[model samples]
Target: LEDPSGGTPYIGSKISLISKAEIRYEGILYTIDTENSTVALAKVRSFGTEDRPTDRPIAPRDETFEYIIFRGSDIKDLTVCEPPKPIM
Candidate 1:
């Protein structure tokens, strides 16, 4: 996976936050905080099986203005639905 801009530019790409129970969140790939081991998200949504929209967007929940944060260790999968670039 490479960002054609030669940097990690994921701000506006729709992604999936896949953890246990196969939960999915589709939204802007806000930030990948290595130090904090978290991935912040905005304009977010959750999806049920068979591509059904599951949850509604929540209010911003972080001081840095993020709508959601997926746990680092618990992030079993990250499926970038629409890439600004290719997935490797």
Candidate 2:
């Protein structure tokens, strides 16, 4: 199989993902599934609340997810950040 992920070499590193719709997500990259064209993240947190219910209108708060899988095609940009640190 070809490199479907565009040669991404940052697995296990902290990363920031910005989707085409401009939703920003931060987390540690857990795994990538080329067959599924999705990337899984651990301890994910998302910024921006688009596509969310706003009938009540409340203060903006960041949302957190234990794990999140992002569609590779939906991601506009990928940034590589620090990797996991060594345990004491």
Task: Assess each prediction's global lDDT (C-alpha) against the native.
Answer: 0.65, 0.74
**lDDT tens digits by residue: candidate 1, 14-42:** 77677654555567877778888888888
**Which regions in candidate 2 have their CA more than 4 angstroms from the true location?**
1-9, 49-59, 83-88
Superposing all C-alpha atoms, what RMSD in Å does each candidate have to the true structure?
7.4, 7.3
Candidate 2, position 5, lDDT: 47
Model 1: CA > 4 A from native: 1-8, 49-66, 84-88
Model 2, range 4-88, lDDT digits (tens) per residue? 3434456767889887666677899788888888889999877765555444454667667888778978889988876433333
Provide the TM-score for each candidate, comma-separated.
Answer: 0.60, 0.63
TM-score of candidate 1 to 2 decimals: 0.60
Q: How many clashes does each candidate structure show, in the order listed?
A: 1, 0
Clashing residue pairs, backbone N/CA/C < 3 A, model 1: 1-88
